Amino acid sequence: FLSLDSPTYVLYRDRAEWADIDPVPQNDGPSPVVQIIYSEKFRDVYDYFRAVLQRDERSERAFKLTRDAIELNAANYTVWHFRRVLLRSLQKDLQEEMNYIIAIIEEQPKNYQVWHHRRVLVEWLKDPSQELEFIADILNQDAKNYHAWQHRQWVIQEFRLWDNELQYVDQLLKEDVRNNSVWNQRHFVISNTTGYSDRAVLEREVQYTLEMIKLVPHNESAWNYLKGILQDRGLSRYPNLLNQLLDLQPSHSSPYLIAFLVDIYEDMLENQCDNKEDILNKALELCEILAKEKDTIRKEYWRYIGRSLQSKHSRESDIPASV
Amino acid sequence: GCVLS
Amino acid sequence: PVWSEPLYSLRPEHARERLQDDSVETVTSIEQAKVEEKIQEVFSSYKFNHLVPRLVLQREKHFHYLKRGLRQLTDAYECLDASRPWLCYWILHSLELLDEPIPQIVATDVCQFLELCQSPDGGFGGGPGQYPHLAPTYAAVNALCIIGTEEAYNVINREKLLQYLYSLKQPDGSFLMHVGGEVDVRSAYCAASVASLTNIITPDLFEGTAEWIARCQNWEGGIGGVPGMEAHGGYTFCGLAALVILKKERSLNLKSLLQWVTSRQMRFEGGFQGRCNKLVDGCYSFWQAGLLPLLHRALHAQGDPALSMSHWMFHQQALQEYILMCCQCPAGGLLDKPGKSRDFYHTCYCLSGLSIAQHFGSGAMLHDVVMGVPENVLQPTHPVYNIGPDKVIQATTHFLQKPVPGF
Numbered sequence: 001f002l003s004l005d006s007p008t009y010v011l012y013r014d015r016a017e018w019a020d021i022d023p024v025p026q027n028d029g030p031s032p033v034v035q036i037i038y039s040e041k042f043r044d045v046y047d048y049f050r051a052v053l054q055r056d057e058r059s060e061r062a063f064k065l066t067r068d069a070i071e072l073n074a075a076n077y078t079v080w081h082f083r084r085v086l087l088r089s090l091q092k093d094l095q096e097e098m099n100y101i102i103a104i105i106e107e108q109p110k111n112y113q114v115w116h117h118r119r120v121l122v123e124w125l126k127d128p129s130q131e132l133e134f135i136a137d138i139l140n141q142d143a144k145n146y147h148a149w150q151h152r153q154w155v156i157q158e159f160r161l162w163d164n165e166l167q168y169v170d171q172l173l174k175e176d177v178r179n180n181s182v183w184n185q186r187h188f189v190i191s192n193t194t195g196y197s198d199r200a201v202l203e204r205e206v207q208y209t210l211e212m213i214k215l216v217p218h219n220e221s222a223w224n225y226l227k228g229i230l231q232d233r234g235l236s237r238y239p240n241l242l243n244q245l246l247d248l249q250p251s252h253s254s255p256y257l258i259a260f261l262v263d264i265y266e267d268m269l270e271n272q273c274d275n276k277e278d279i280l281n282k283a284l285e286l287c288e289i290l291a292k293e294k295d296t297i298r299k300e301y302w303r304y305i306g307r308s309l310q311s312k313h314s315r316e317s318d319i320p321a322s323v
Numbered sequence: 324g325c326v327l328s
Numbered sequence: 329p330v331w332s333e334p335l336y337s338l339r340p341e342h343a344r345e346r347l348q349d350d351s352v353e354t355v356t357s358i359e360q361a362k363v364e365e366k367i368q369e370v371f372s373s374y375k376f377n378h379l380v381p382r383l384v385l386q387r388e389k390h391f392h393y394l395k396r397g398l399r400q401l402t403d404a405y406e407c408l409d410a411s412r413p414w415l416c417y418w419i420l421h422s423l424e425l426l427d428e429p430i431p432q433i434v435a436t437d438v439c440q441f442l443e444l445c446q447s448p449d450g451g452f453g454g455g456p457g458q459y460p461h462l463a464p465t466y467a468a469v470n471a472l473c474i475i476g477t478e479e480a481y482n483v484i485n486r487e488k489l490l491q492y493l494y495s496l497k498q499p500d501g502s503f504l505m506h507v508g509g510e511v512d513v514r515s516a517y518c519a520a521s522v523a524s525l526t527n528i529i530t531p532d533l534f535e536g537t538a539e540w541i542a543r544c545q546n547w548e549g550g551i552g553g554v555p556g557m558e559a560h561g562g563y564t565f566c567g568l569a570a571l572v573i574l575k576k577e578r579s580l581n582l583k584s585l586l587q588w589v590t591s592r593q594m595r596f597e598g599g600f601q602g603r604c605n606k607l608v609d610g611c612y613s614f615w616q617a618g619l620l621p622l623l624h625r626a627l628h629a630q631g632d633p634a635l636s637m638s639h640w641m642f643h644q645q646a647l648q649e650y651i652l653m654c655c656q657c658p659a660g661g662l663l664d665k666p667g668k669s670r671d672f673y674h675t676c677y678c679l680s681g682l683s684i685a686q687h688f689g690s691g692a693m694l695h696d697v698v699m700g701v702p703e704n705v706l707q708p709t710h711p712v713y714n715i716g717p718d719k720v721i722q723a724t725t726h727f728l729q730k731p732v733p734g735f
């Protein structure tokens with residue numbers, strides 16, 4: 001009825017329809033800590049929320065009161081719980097509640113409670129028809145909203161709405177090929193649909209990634225993805241990769257390409273390859289170049305890697321102490 | 324800023 | 329040398345660490361360049377003002393900020409009216425790190441307040457009369473342990489706490505954050521943290537939990553909120569720390585994890601980002617860098633011989649430089665990045681992260697790195713609970729005298 005920001009908004013202690021209720025002051029104790037000096041409006045709404053909660057008054061007025069309490073602090077999970085209790089007891093129209101949550105998330109999209117509330121509504125209605133579009137609108141304002149992506153994965157997974165997501169992913173990667181959330185969504189969609197074992201798919205993905213890497217050699221997301229989809233089977237399992245990466249050494253170098261090379265060498269020395277020494281030195285050479293020039297912020301990591309490789313792949317690594 | 328809960 | 333710059337972020341070569349957008353601009357590169365430009369200004373402000381750089385942790389200012397906030401807050405904190413135990417914890421821990429005593433007048437008033445936040449059914453709520461929730465429960469327990477008095481310990485109703493944890497446990501191994509609430513890796517960590525400290529861990533409380541957490545590790549090497557989600561420092565800290573408490577760190581691919589977190593430190597800024605291709609932020613000085621002490625203990629537990637015995641696997645100096653030069657508010661308190669306003673959350677974690685970067689300790693081995701003036705050194709923090717290492721020992725020892733609820 002009366003909006004919290006309305007110019008003619010009135011405190012609850014000045015509302016006739018609330019005269020029967022005695023507000024309940026916050027019980028902070030004799031000598032409080034981290035006591036918040038709430039504004040009049042805030043303390044007033046909550047003093048009355050505390051009253052209805054305490055009486056467990058499940059009424060239309062209590063329902064409207066939770067809207068204001070939520071508006072004052074959308075992170076108050078206790079108010080959200082009571083509101084859901086009211087939604088059921090009062091048999092409130094859930095689509096109307098959906099319209100409401102849609103609006104609240106639009107204004108406070110980084111809050112945990114609002115997304116969980118929307119999920120509960122979808123679960124109750126067993127209707128995901130509005131989700132992908134709603135989420136898309138939120139993602140259009142912040143393409144990396146964590147809660148939005150999490151809700152999207154949940155919706156897609158629970159109702160099996162995989163059909164158009166890869167298309168959605170391509171669209172966003174086009175807008176910003178650096179969006180790690182979208183690279184994650186790509187891995188989400190594919191591994192749950194075709195999988196990465198189908199050689200035709202894996203082939204496609206690697207070509208796509210290398211292609212994105214050529215267009216933006218310093219975009220760390222493409223590199224992490226390329227590594228993420230090949231590391232489980234073993235990088236050494238793909239002999240052409242190593243070479244093809246060296247072909248970018250001149251015109252597309254980055255600390256990322258250098259780092260990948262080390263990962264390939266690493267796995268190669270793991271699956272005992274040919275010239276188990278020519279590879280090792282090639283690796284320590286890169287590890288040093290990174291720890292001292294191309295990627296010093298990670299010097300402590302690169303020295304550890306160079307050390308680990310030497311500690312188990314040097315020609316002396318399998319040789320007795322007495323020899 | 325950031326949120327934890 | 330005389331021409332040699334002792335500060336990593338000011339060295340001429342550092343300029344090469346600026347972002348290379350390959351002439352391909354997207355929202356991401358643009359935002360990243362904006363931040364670097366602002367951070368560069370901070371770095372070279374000494375040069376332009378013709379002054380000698382000096383890194384000072386404004387202890388006095390932070391103390392005043394914290395001392396007052398522990399008692400009273402402006403309406404700016406209305407958005408945290410359901411996170412008051414968090415406020416108690418962030419502040420008390422900051423004071424602890426700064427090595428400031430906690431008057432018994434305060435300690436006892438904190439105890440009584442948290443008592444009021446405790447639910448009749450177990451666990452703590454975000455405030456008096458609020459339903460119990462694992463985040464404020466975690467904060468409350470940590471706060472009481474930092475105080476470490478018999479009184480603080482006795483506030484915690486161990487029987488009900490356990491009952492509460494069970495009421496949230498799911499069949500798949502995960503926990504709800506609160507009744508009728510959401511599920512993500514934070515709950516596993518909050519539960520493990522309070523259960524282990526108060527000694528209420530039963531044989532089946534965490535069955536399947538290690539497995540569920542392990543499912544959150546993704547293709548990136550890091551851990552996401554729930555299975556399938558992007559890797560994030562906040563959830564990764566929760567996941568690994570919980571697994572460490574449960575002694576199941578091995579359930580994860582520690583190698584891919586180590587590579588992911590070390591890649592989260594920004595080459596230019598020196599601080600950490602929360603996820604790949606996003607912005608640096610002071611609170612990750614703890615959530616991300618705090619992982620390294622955990623990985624060190626996990627790998628060393630596996631007999632990893634290549635483990636350094638003096639430093640963590642992240643640029644300790646660069647992190648300290650970022651925090652000290654870019655994350656302090658002149659009026660006291662710390663923050664996300666230059667241009668952001670202070671708050672107790674960032675004050676707590678920027679300091680926790682600074683401590684981690686200053687103190688290395690792998691058993692008998694002990695090496696410190698204190699950038700700037702020596703007064704900058706803070707008290708150490710436990711990498712799992714993020715409270716004094718002594719408070720942890722003292723607390724667990726105290727509760728180990730009690731019997732696990734129900735025996």
Ligand SMILES: CC(C)=CCC/C(C)=C/CC/C(C)=C/CONC(=O)CP(=O)(O)O
Pocket residue numbers: 110146147325326327328463514517560561562563566601602603606607609615
């Ligand atoms: C013990 C607890 C409660 C740990 C949680 C620590 C964190 C930091 C959780 C973060 C959750 C999250 C990713 C929320 C989404 O909003 N965050 C951002 O967008 C910040 P960024 O851009 O740095 O990822």
Ligand SMILES: [Zn+2]
Pocket residue numbers: 324325609610611612664674
């Ligand atoms: Zn932050």
